[PDB]
């Protein structure tokens, strides 16, 4: 509580910055008021970062290749350009899949054009065509190729669209050019938009005239779940236990055939609104498929989402939903009874990219834990509209927070546990506050659904109550 002291903290943190940076960053920090549903009057987001302030944001290439296109297992993704971008992003995101890597699955592999000075000076369209030929020769079981753009291609004027068209006509193969150069936009969000547009333009409509697929009234498609440590899998089983048939999965453990079959489903269950809202809306306009957002973080949100989803179908689906809820009730009740006493009353500050800073609040509250501060790297204002009603009164909200701001806020608020990325983990561990990686789940999980809830509680308990946190001060100091 104590909104006024939070505003005083905000101003005190702001005092260090220069005039222009001061006034820019003042708009991106806010004190939450749950009654406010219009976050534009309270917080500004989706703007360019201030130079030299150590932001956490990524680039559009990370949004497109790293997030959306990369998880597709049966397609080969060429990081077209210099060698760094593919190397730093190779296998850094735990998008789980089932396949034989190097034969019919290529997710953890780094394909790149390895640009040199001659390619910068004289262009790389011919090199792109030669690379496509070599990929066809060396990986015959591939079912499609994507060409993900890095900065030099956008700067030097290479026409990858024409190369993709000619080579796709030549080899009768799907070649998707993505203009995902890193200087476009201000974060990974424009990467999401560009990848969605590429999916729409080059992949989605390939089976519009095809009617051989047998459809059922219970066909659904999971959109925006990227199977982080198997998360999507732990969701699908629940949906399969409710009696629904999951045809497609965007894009965790995903295949191009599933994306092609997506326009045949009856309902689109969207988990990450921020990354997949474009394609969900496009599918609604073109095929008439309704979509709905759902949350599988924690037993309460999972039950609410399951009942809301079952409400879209007939009575048998609702009965199956009640059966599933009854079956899984004792497990999460036992998890709560075991772990809530060790977690009750602790305070959490969160800072993640665009969906989780508000999605995981319910799971934390299910264990008797309070979120006092939250923020986003690249969310839009509608995300903050959704965030305000789920956060407590007079809690701190931050957009595109700087490292200095984050450290000062943590030092003042003194939370019991911080959830953020790898670029804050060791900073906050050295100050003696427990930290959980909330992008990759600290190489653990999954966290979605009932099975993931137990892992979530176990991980939170193991990190928050670890004895190591009592030892930072030497006995003679």
């Amino acid at each position: 509580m104590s909104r006024e002291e939070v505003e005083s903290l905000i101003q005190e943190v702001l005092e260090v910055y220069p005039e222009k940076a001061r006034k820019d960053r003042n708009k991106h920090l806010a004190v939450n008021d749950p009654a406010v549903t219009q976050s534009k009057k309270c917080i500004i987001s989706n703007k360019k970062s201030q130079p030299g302030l150590m932001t956490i944001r990524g680039c559009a290439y990370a949004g497109s290749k790293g997030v959306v296109w990369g998880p597709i297992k049966d397609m080969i993704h060429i990081s077209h350009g210099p060698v760094g971008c593919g190397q730093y992003s190779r296998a850094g995101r735990r998008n789980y899949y089932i396949g034989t890597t190097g034969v019919n699955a290529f997710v953890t592999m780094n394909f790149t054009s390895d640009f040199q000075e001659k390619d910068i000076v004289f262009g790389g369209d011919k090199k792109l065509a030669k690379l496509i030929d070599e990929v066809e020769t060396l990986f015959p079981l591939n079912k499609g190729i994507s060409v993900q753009s890095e900065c030099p291609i956008g700067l030097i004027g290479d026409d990858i669209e024409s190369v993709s068209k000619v080579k796709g006509a030549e080899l009768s193969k799907t070649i998707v050019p993505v203009r995902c150069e890193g200087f476009r936009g201000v974060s990974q969000s424009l990467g999401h938009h560009i990848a969605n547009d590429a999916v729409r333009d080059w992949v989605l409509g390939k089976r519009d005239e095809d009617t051989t697929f047998a459809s059922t009234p219970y066909d659904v498609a999971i959109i925006g779940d990227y199977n982080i440590g198997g998360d999507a899998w732990s969701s699908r089983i629940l949906l399969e236990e409710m009696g629904l048939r999951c045809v497609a999965q965007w894009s965790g453990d995903g295949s191009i055939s599933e994306i092609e079959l997506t326009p045949k489903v009856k309902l689109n269950l969207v988990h990450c609104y921020r990354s997949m809202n474009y394609i969900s809306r496009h599918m609604e306009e073109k095929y008439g498929i309704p979509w709905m957002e759902y949350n599988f973080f924690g037993p309460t949100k999972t039950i609410e989402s399951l009942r809301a989803i079952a409400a879209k179908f007939d009575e048998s689906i609702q009965k199956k939903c009640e059966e599933v809820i009854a079956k899984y009730k004792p497990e999460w009740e036992a998890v709560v009874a075991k772990y809530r006493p060790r977690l009750e009353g602790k305070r959490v500050m969160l800072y993640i990219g665009g969906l989780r800073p508000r999605h995981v609040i319910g799971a934390y509250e299910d264990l008797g834990m309070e979120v006092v501060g939250t923020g986003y790297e690249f969310a839009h204002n509608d995300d903050y509209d959704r965030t305000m009603k789920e956060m407590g009164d007079s809690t701190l909200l931050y957009d595109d927070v700087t490292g200095y701001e984050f450290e000062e806020f943590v030092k003042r608020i003194k939370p019991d546990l911080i959830g953020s990325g790898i670029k804050e983990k060791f900073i906050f561990q050295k100050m003696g506050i427990p930290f959980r990686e909330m992008h990759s789940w600290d190489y653990s999980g999954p966290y979605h659904g009932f099975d993931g809830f137990a892992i979530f509680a176990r991980d939170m308990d193991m990190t928050l109550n670890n004895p190591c946190w009592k030892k930072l001060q030497a006995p003679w100091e």
Partner: protein
């Protein structure tokens, strides 16, 4: 389902029957997967020599490279100076990737800033971004000095760092006296080690080019040591320790070990240790400059010989036995200090370990990869141990380095069956270790997938990986290890011999089948 007393993570909870049935249904219904026999036949084909010829005929496609881009090395070089902020002029995604990479390797905070250039800068350049970023960085994080590198965006656009920084100083954004060294680090030229070389050369230029009138060689009675791109903190520590026991005054340039190994005592230190500006300014007064990794510090050598007028010795990386000896005697000759008894005793202990482990070490076949200097040092040490290198790969190597490596290989009968590959990636190496199977690989974490592939062919075809190099992501605290000098040679020898012994123990653990050779004493 989960049991509250024994909760299972992704492995092995996805091995439950319900999840297996779900995955089988998904694959059979919607993935349109190729038949398993087709997949097996394609895999077997990729294990063959014809696939190896097709793989080595590649000219445009690179698969799983073994290098990075220049600004990463530039950031590593910049972090080695006291209260210095690495500053990358360009797009922010590169800085995010560099920070994540170094965080995962070192398990430590890594500080670096960007000026966040966008399409507007793609049209008009990033001068305003440079001014605002320098002002904001100095005001917020209070560094003593800002070292500026570039992303490929700024390099392709053509931004002039010198003019931009001069205009920043002229317009009052940052003080004129504030040191702002800069270097162009194009990602399409060389690799990360080239970026390290460029960063160091630019910093040394900034601090010494315009003040050489009063410099006299040998005035301060010290020896400059330039480590290059280095990711083992034990290497800095052992260099300093050996120079200390010898009583040799030294000035180590770009020291990042303090800032990369800060204690966890309740406070966050953004800066720690590092080479001071006074040392950089006084460097031309040293007796000489020793370059630890000469094969990626050629520009630095050119500057040091041309301007500081230092006769830089022709020294290899002090790895293994002979090259450490040569480094020690060269340092003794330059400084005039005799080699003490402690170093002789340490060398004798290393020789004793070699004699103790020679029987298991002899004749073993290794594939290996990494940076040129490290690769040649490890190949030399393996030859000294009686080991046989077979596949030697260096993605960022050149032809002269290959010639020197071939010369090293010709001087020992254990290098008869060895081939050096430059410009090849780890897909090439996977083909090589399928077609000409060694006993072990030596490389970074990316080799683990290669290991997996061999297990897929069979237990008898598996090539275990030995984790030496950069980056190491799947093991903890290996960045504290030592590779240079006698201590590093001891550590490498112990790792190699014990990996051999663990492999032998695993192969002979089957009761009544292979356990007749499961000897207690080895």
């Amino acid at each position: 389902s989960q049991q509250v007393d024994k909760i299972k993570a992704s492995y092995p909870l996805f091995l439950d029957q319900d999840y297996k049935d779900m995955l089988a249904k998904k694959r059979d219904g919607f993935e349109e997967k190729y038949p398993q026999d087709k997949i097996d036949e394609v895999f077997q084909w990729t294990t063959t020599k014809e696939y190896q010829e097709l793989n080595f005929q590649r000219e445009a496609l690179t698969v799983n490279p073994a290098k990075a881009c220049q600004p990463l090395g530039a950031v590593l070089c910049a972090l080695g100076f006291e209260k210095t902020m690495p500053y990358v002029h360009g797009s922010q995604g590169c800085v995010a990737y560099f920070r994540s990479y170094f965080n995962r390797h070192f398990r430590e905070p890594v500080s670096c800033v960007s000026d966040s250039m966008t399409e507007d800068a793609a049209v008009f350049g990033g001068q305003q971004n440079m001014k605002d970023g320098l002002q904001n960085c100095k005001a917020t994080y209070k560094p003593d000095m800002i070292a500026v590198s570039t992303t490929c965006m700024a390099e392709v656009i053509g931004d002039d760092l010198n003019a931009f920084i001069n205009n920043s100083k002229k317009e009052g954004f940052i003080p004129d006296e504030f040191p702002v060294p800069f270097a162009h680090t194009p990602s399409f030229v060389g690799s990360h080690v080239t970026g390290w070389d460029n960063m160091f050369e630019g910093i040394a230029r900034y601090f010494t080019l315009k003040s050489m009138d009063d410099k006299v060689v040998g005035s301060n009675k010290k020896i400059n040591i330039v480590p290059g791109f280095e990711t083992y903190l034990g290497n800095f520590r052992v260099i300093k320790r050996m120079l200390s026991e010898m009583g040799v005054g030294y000035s180590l340039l770009s020291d990042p070990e303090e800032v990369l190994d800060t204690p966890a005592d309740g406070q966050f230190r953004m800066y720690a240790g590092g080479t001071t500006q006074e040392e950089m300014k006084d460097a031309p007064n040293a007796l000489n400059t020793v370059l630890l990794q000469p094969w990626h510090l050629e520009k630095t050598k050119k500057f040091v010989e041309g301007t500081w007028k230092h006769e830089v010795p022709k020294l290899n990386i002090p790895m293994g036995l002979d090259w450490t000896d040569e480094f020690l005697m060269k340092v003794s000759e330059i400084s005039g200090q005799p080699i003490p008894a402690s170093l002789t005793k340490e060398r004798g202990r290393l020789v004793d370990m070699m004699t103790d482990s020679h029987t298991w070490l002899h004749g073993k076949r290794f594939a290996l990869w990494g940076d040129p200097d490290f690769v040649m040092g490890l190949v030399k040490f393996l030859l000294e141990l009686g080991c046989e290198p077979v596949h030697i790969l260096c993605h960022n190597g050149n032809k002269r380095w290959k010639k020197a490596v071939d010369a090293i290989l010709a001087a020992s009968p254990y290098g008869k069956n060895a081939t050096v590959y430059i410009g090849k990636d780890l897909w090439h190496l996977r083909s090589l270790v399928f077609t000409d199977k060694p006993d072990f690989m030596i490389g970074n974490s990316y080799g683990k997938f290669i290991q997996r592939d061999t297990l897929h062919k069979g237990k008898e075809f598996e090539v275990p990986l030995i984790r030496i190099g950069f980056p190491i992501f799947d093991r903890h605290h290996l960045h504290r290890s030592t590779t240079l000098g006698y201590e590093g040679a001891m550590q490498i020898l112990t790792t190699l011999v014990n990996s051999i012994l663990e492999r032998l123990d695993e192969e002979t653990r089957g009761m009544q089948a292979t356990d007749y050779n499961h000897d207690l004493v080895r």
